[PDB]
RNA sequence: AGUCUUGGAGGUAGAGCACUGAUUGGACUAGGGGCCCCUACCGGGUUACCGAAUUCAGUCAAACUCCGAAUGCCAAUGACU
């Protein structure tokens, strides 16, 4: 299915490894709501971070 | 470029004491002197006077490895952004 991905959190103050992964999700600023499909590829990014992001299912 | 995917290369942290060294303690002991006895340093007895090896347990390492993670790196492979 689909799921929404937002930010509670800014990227400034976080390492370089977790910085570009935010860029690849389409997320640039804070509070930028972005929807994608429930796939294990994007789930692996969330499982890698899970703490800049408040996840949102449907 | 990132994530997931399978595939490795590699010998730290850890852990182990099998190699390397270090080192505890007991049993045991070649052998060694010593109380010295009998006495050509020659015949043999003796102790906790030591003791190599010996095995039993016991620790220890930046330059000890039979072992060995997380990650990080080169990948192929598709998928997504």
From Swiss-Prot:
HAMAP family: Ribosomal_uL30_B (MF_01371_B)
GO molecular function, one term: structural constituent of ribosome
GO biological process, one term: translation
Gene: rpmD
Annotated Gene3D superfamilies: Ribosomal protein L30, ferredoxin-like fold domain
PANTHER family assigned to the protein according to its UniProt record, in alphabetical order: LARGE RIBOSOMAL SUBUNIT PROTEIN UL30M (PTHR15892:SF2), MITOCHONDRIAL RIBOSOMAL PROTEIN L30 (PTHR15892)
The organism of origin for this protein: Bacillus subtilis (strain 168)
Complexes and interactors: Part of the 50S ribosomal subunit.
Entry-linked Pfam families: Ribosomal_L30
One GO CC term on file: cytosolic large ribosomal subunit
Keywords from the named record: Ribonucleoprotein, Ribosomal protein
Similarity section: Belongs to the universal ribosomal protein uL30 family.
Protein name (record): Large ribosomal subunit protein uL30
Keyword Plastid found: no
């Amino acid at each position: 299915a689909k799921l929404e991905i937002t930010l509670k959190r800014s990227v400034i103050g976080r390492p370089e490894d977790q910085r570009v992964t935010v860029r690849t999700l389409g997320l640039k600023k804070t509070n930028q709501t972005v929807v994608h499909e429930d796939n294990a590829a994007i789930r692996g990014m969330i499982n890698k971070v899970s703490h800049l992001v408040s996840v949102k299912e449907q």
